[PDB]
Amino acid sequence: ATPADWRSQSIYFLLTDRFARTDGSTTATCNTADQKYCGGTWQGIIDKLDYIQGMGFTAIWITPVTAQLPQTTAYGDAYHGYWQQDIYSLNENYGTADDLKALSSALHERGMYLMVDVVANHMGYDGAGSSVDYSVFKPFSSQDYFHPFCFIQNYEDQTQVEDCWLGDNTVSLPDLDTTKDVVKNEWYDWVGSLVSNYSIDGLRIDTVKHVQKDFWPGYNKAAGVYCIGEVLDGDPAYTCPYQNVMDGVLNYPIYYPLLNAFKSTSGSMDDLYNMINTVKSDCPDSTLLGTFVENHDNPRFASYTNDIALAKNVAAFIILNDGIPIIYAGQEQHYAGGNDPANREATWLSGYPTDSELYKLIASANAIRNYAISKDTGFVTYKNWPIYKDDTTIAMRKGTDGSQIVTILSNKGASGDSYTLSLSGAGYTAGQQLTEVIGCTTVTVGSDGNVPVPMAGGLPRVLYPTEKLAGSKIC
Ligand SMILES: *[C@@H]1O[C@H](CO)[C@@H](O)[C@H](O)[C@H]1NC(C)=O
Ligand SMILES: [Ca+2]
Ligand SMILES: [Gd]
Ligand SMILES: [Gd]
Ligand SMILES: [Gd]
Ligand SMILES: [Gd]
Ligand SMILES: [Gd]
Ligand SMILES: [Gd]
Numbered sequence: 001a002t003p004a005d006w007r008s009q010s011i012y013f014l015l016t017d018r019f020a021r022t023d024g025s026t027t028a029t030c031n032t033a034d035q036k037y038c039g040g041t042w043q044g045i046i047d048k049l050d051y052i053q054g055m056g057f058t059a060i061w062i063t064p065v066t067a068q069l070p071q072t073t074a075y076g077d078a079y080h081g082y083w084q085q086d087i088y089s090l091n092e093n094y095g096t097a098d099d100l101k102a103l104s105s106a107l108h109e110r111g112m113y114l115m116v117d118v119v120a121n122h123m124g125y126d127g128a129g130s131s132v133d134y135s136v137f138k139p140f141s142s143q144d145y146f147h148p149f150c151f152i153q154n155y156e157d158q159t160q161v162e163d164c165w166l167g168d169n170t171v172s173l174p175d176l177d178t179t180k181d182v183v184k185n186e187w188y189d190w191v192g193s194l195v196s197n198y199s200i201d202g203l204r205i206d207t208v209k210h211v212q213k214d215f216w217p218g219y220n221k222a223a224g225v226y227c228i229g230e231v232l233d234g235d236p237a238y239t240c241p242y243q244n245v246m247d248g249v250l251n252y253p254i255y256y257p258l259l260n261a262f263k264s265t266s267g268s269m270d271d272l273y274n275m276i277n278t279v280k281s282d283c284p285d286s287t288l289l290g291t292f293v294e295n296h297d298n299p300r301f302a303s304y305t306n307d308i309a310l311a312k313n314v315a316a317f318i319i320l321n322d323g324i325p326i327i328y329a330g331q332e333q334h335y336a337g338g339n340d341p342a343n344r345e346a347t348w349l350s351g352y353p354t355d356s357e358l359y360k361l362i363a364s365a366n367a368i369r370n371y372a373i374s375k376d377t378g379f380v381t382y383k384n385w386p387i388y389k390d391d392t393t394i395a396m397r398k399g400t401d402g403s404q405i406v407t408i409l410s411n412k413g414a415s416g417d418s419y420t421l422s423l424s425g426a427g428y429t430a431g432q433q434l435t436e437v438i439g440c441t442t443v444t445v446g447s448d449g450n451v452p453v454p455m456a457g458g459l460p461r462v463l464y465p466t467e468k469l470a471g472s473k474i475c
Contacts, residue, residue: 035076056366083124
C-alpha cells in the first residue's frame with residue numbers, strides 16, 4: 001500500500017517464532033536463553049488476530065520469511081529470521097507459502113495490513129567468515145556477489161559500516177556487494193515478486209545504514225509499497241537523511257530521549273520536547289516515521305522500571321506522536337526482558353489476557369486515534385506540536401482546530417500525587433466540553449481557554465471534544 005495509506009496505520013510488531021503457535025498453546029516451552037525455534041507460526045498469528053485487532057491495531061509487522069541457515073549454531077537457531085540463505089524458499093518453521101498467503105488474506109479480511117521484515121544487506125552463515133561455502137546461498141551462490149571478508153571495527157567509518165561484515169566468526173553475516181548491478185537487479189526483482197506473491201502491503205527494511213544509499217531508491221520503487229527502514233542511530237542528522245531514499249525510517253532519534261524521559265521519575269522532559277521539535281523540523285516528513293520505545297534490539301521498557309503508570313505514559317506517546325505507532329508484542333503484557341535474547345520472550349506464555357492494564361491502555365489510545373482519523377483527514381499530516389513542559393510533564397497537540405487530540409504525559413509514576421494542571425495552549429475554544437478518553441471522564445475548557453486537567457497516579461490524560469465523540473463507542 002502507499003505511504004499516504006500507511007500514515008493512518010498502527011502497527012503491532014511481532015516475532016513469528018515467538019508470538020503464537022499453530023496449536024495455540026500458552027505453556028509450550030520457550031526459554032529465551034536457549035535461542036532455539038519455539039514454534040511460532042503464521043497460522044498461529046491468524047488464530048490470534050482478534051487479540052491483536054482488539055487493541056486497535058490496523059497492521060502487523062512480522063519478522064523475515066526467507067529460508068534461513070539450518071544449523072543450530074553456538075548462538076542458537078535462526079528463529080528471528082535475520083540469517084537468511086535461500087531467498088526463494090520460505091522458512092519451513094513458520095509454515096508454507098499457502099500459510100503466508102492465508103495470513104495476508106486473514107489480515108485483509110479484517111481491513112488490516114501485512115508488513116514484512118526484509119534483509120538486503122547480508123546472508124547468515126554458521127561459522128567463520130573464512131569458512132563460508134558460498135554455494136549454499138540462493139541466488140547469490142558465489143563469493144563474487146559479496147564484499148571481501150572484514151568485520152566492522154569502527155562504526156563511525158561509514159565506508160566500513162557499508163563494506164564490511166556484521167556478526168563475527170561464530171555466526172558470520174556474509175555482506176552482499178550491493179554496489180554490483182547483478183546484486184541490485186536480483187534484489188529488485190526479488191522484492192517485487194515477494195510483495196506480489198504474498199499480497200504484502202508494506203515492508204520494514206533491516207540494517208539500512210549498512211547498505212550504500214544509492215541502493216535504496218531502486219529497492220523501494222521495485223517493492224511498490226511503503227517502506228520503513230531501520231537506521232540504528234539516535235542522531236537525527238544521520239538517520240533522517242535516509243528518508244530521502246526511503247519512504248520512512250524508524251524513529252530512533254525519538255527513542256532514546258523518550259525512553260529516558262519515562263524510564264524513571266527523574267527523566268529529562270526537555271530532551272524529549274526538543275527532539276520532537278528537531279525531528280519535526282529536520283526530518284523530511286515526521287509523519288512517515290515509526291514511533292516506538294520497545295523492540296527486539298534493546299532492553300524492554302519494563303526492564304528499567306515496572307511502574308505501570310510510566311509504561312502507560314510511554315505507550316500513549318507512541319500511539320499519539322507523529323507517524324506510525326509501533327508496539328512490540330509483549331509490551332502490552334508488560335514484558336521486562338533485557339538485551340538479546342532476553343527481549344524475545346514468547347507472547348503466548350502470558351496467556352494473551354485482554355484485560356491487562358497495558359492492553360486496555362493501548363486499546364483506548366488506538367481507539368481515539370482511529371476515531372479521530374476517521375473524523376479528520378488532516379490529522380495524520382498535522383505536525384504534533386509540544387504545547388507544554390516541565391520537570392515531570394509534557395503535553396502535545398495534534399489534529400485540526402476543533403478536532404485536535406491533546407495529550408498530557410507524566411513521569412511522576414504510580415505514587416504521583418493528585419492535583420490539577422492548568423493546561424494552556426490546547427487550542428480548544430473557551431467553554432468547550434472535553435472527554436478524557438483514557439479514564440473516561442469529562443472536563444470543560446476554562447473561560448480562559450485553559451484546561452483544568454485532573455492529574456492523579458501519574459496517569460496519562462488524552463483529551464478530545466466531547467460532542468465529536470457522539471456515535472463512537474468511546475467512553
Ligand atoms: C513467486 O511465485 C512464483 C510462482 O508462483 C515462484 O516461482 C517465485 O519463486 C516466487 N517469488 C518469490 C520472491 O517468492
Ligand atoms: Ca553492507
Ligand atoms: Gd487455526
Ligand atoms: Gd472475531
Ligand atoms: Gd553513529
Ligand atoms: Gd537490524
Ligand atoms: Gd551516531
Ligand atoms: Gd532545523
